[PDB]
Amino acid sequence: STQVNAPSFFHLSVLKDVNWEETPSFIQEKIPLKGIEEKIAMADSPIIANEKNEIMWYFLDPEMPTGKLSIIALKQGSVTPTPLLFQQESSEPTWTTSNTIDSTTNELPLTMSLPSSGLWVLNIYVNEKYYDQFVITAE
Amino acid sequence: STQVNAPSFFHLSVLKDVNWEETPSFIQEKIPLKGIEEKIAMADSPIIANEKNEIMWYFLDPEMPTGKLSIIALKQGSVTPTPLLFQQESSEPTWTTSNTIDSTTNELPLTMSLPSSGLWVLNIYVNEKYYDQFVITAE
């Protein structure tokens, strides 16, 4: 992007095969989840633009890599990446959790906010290495 | 912005009276400086887009407020704020220094990078309160 900075581990090429449709919900242990089955997902909770929402994240992958977790978001039709973490009443959006996750973390609450309504792709990194991605809807 | 998140203390209204011209250099103690005289300035060093450059910052204000220092940048013609700090070989751009400055700090080295060439306004906050702003040129 000519307009903003992004982490050095972020490349636009992750956008290449994105299917711009909301990721379908699925049930894990009787509760609704959104994301990639058997890998990573968040609680199927409604996301309202410009509203900080604490959403439980789930690390389904039994071999989840160790490291800090990063989430880099882009709106549909955008080449401008943005952070969505607003941790612990912070006034600043952060790319990366302060805590380190691993195969034993299982679950972690993250407070998120998206600046406008529409489809957003969530690019996920662990220890600065690309992990996966999925699309969510902000109302 | 509909496209990215920004710190809650950042408002677009800081753009209102910006004069979109490079801030003129001035001499302080025999060395060239860019910024606001008697307040805050950086060494007059060439800024090359997409090149991390460690630039010495100077706190001229004898009553410089105490707090972490934030810099929020916007390119000319942009409503999309971005961080420019790349501290201590970090792969991530940060809004805010990890260290707290005060009236006795005087000087501090900051490593910066701008994503594209042109005029950029630098909005400066201390302890999350607006301090000042000035325009620089990236080549």
TrEMBL record, chains A, B:
Keywords assigned by UniProt, alphabetized: Lipoprotein, Signal
Superkingdom of this protein's organism: Bacteria
Ranges annotated as spanning the membrane: none
Name of the protein in its database record: Lipoprotein
Annotated organism of origin: Bacillus anthracis
